[PDB]
């Protein structure tokens, strides 16, 4: 399948080169997979989600996304126009308040929630979790991310936006999950992207168009935007049978575009997520 005039990041993940604008993908499109977006919530009524999104958990007085961030990330995973995996099921877990903040104990609870809750959902092709959030190093936050991964969920986490080594942030620094840095449309490391040995992969993260609250759309930047590209890619590849939740991060790194990015510090992988789809 081909989607013309796609957001640059979708085109980038199906291309060997920057500078194109059509997204190419197998029409299975992540059908039969599930992606949990652990964030500020999801505006599931947005037409772009087509009934495939739902809130399943909140830790606040409401499940509504009063911010937009979680809706944007969910849109990059799986919206019809802005998403990588256009037929995945999206599940919202609101661990962040409408200011975008949350206590680590709530974030931990949300991760353990997903590890259990997937047993209440139909995801025959597999389960992914997208965590576009983080803070300073916490062994308890890392352990929760490790448990979620161990339970059979492909965990993708943002590297962080400090232009610093991600070893000092969580859950970015957990080795067993998939830690995602950000790139721009000219194949430069995004100026704010964290780096370091703990990164597994880069995805598009500067000037990413996606869904927003109020039935709208907007372009924003962050490792938060790169992470759902990788989460959606994992769901798509799992539906194709190419990999599994336990192996998807390694598979994505194995099959990534290699050496294309500029300003990658020595010791950080030069790997850009790529679906290897041949139309």
From Swiss-Prot:
Residues reported to bind Ca(2+) 1: 175, 177, 200
Bound cofactor: record note: Binds 2 calcium ions per subunit.
A single MF term (Gene Ontology): serine-type endopeptidase activity
Catalytic reaction equation(s): Hydrolysis of keratin, and of other proteins with subtilisin-like specificity. Hydrolyzes peptide amides
Keywords, comma-separated and alphabetical: Calcium, Disulfide bond, Hydrolase, Metal-binding, Protease, Serine protease, Signal, Zymogen
GO biological process annotation, one example: proteolysis
Active site: 39 (charge relay system), 69 (charge relay system), 224 (charge relay system)
Cysteine pairings via disulfide bonds: 34-123, 178-249
Calcium recorded as keyword: yes
EC assignment: 3.4.21.64
Necessary cofactors: Ca(2+)
Ranges where the Peptidase S8 domain occurs: 7-279
Binding site for Ca(2+) 2: 16, 260
The family this protein is said to belong to: Belongs to the peptidase S8 family.
Function: Hydrolyzes keratin at aromatic and hydrophobic residues.
UniProt protein name: Proteinase K
Protein's organism: Parengyodontium album (Tritirachium album)
Biological classification of the source: Eukaryota, Fungi, Dikarya, Ascomycota, Pezizomycotina
Record gene name: PROK
């Amino acid at each position: 399948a081909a989607q013309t005039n796609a957001p640059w990041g979708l085109a980038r993940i199906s291309s060997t080169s920057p500078g194109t604008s059509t997204y190419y993908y197998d029409e299975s499109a992540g059908q039969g997979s599930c992606v949990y977006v652990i964030d500020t919530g999801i505006e599931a009524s947005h037409p772009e989600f087509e009934g495939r999104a739902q809130m399943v958990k909140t830790y606040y007085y409401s499940s509504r996304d009063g911010n937009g961030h979680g809706t944007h990330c969910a849109g990059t995973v799986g919206s019809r126009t802005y998403g990588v995996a256009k037929k995945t099921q999206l599940f919202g877990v609101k661990v962040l308040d409408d200011n975008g903040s949350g206590q680590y104990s709530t974030i931990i609870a949300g991760m353990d929630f997903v590890a259990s809750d997937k047993n209440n959902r139909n995801c025959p092709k597999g389960v992914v979790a997208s965590l576009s959030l983080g803070g300073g190093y916490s062994s308890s936050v890392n352990s929760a991310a490790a448990r979620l991964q161990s339970s059979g969920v492909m965990v993708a986490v943002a590297a962080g936006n400090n232009n610093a080594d991600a070893r000092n942030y969580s859950p970015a620094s957990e080795p067993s999950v998939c830690t995602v840095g950000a790139s721009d449309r000219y194949d430069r490391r995004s100026s704010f992207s964290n780096y370091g040995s703990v990164l597994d992969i880069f995805g598009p993260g500067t000037d990413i168009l996606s869904t927003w609250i109020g039935g709208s759309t907007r372009s924003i930047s962050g490792t938060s935007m790169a992470t759902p590209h990788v989460a959606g890619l994992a769901a798509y590849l799992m539906t194709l049978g190419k990999t599994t939740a336990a192996s998807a991060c390694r598979y994505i790194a194995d099959t990534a575009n290699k050496g294309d990015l500029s300003n990658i510090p020595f010791g950080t992988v030069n790997l850009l997520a790529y679906n290897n789809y041949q139309a």
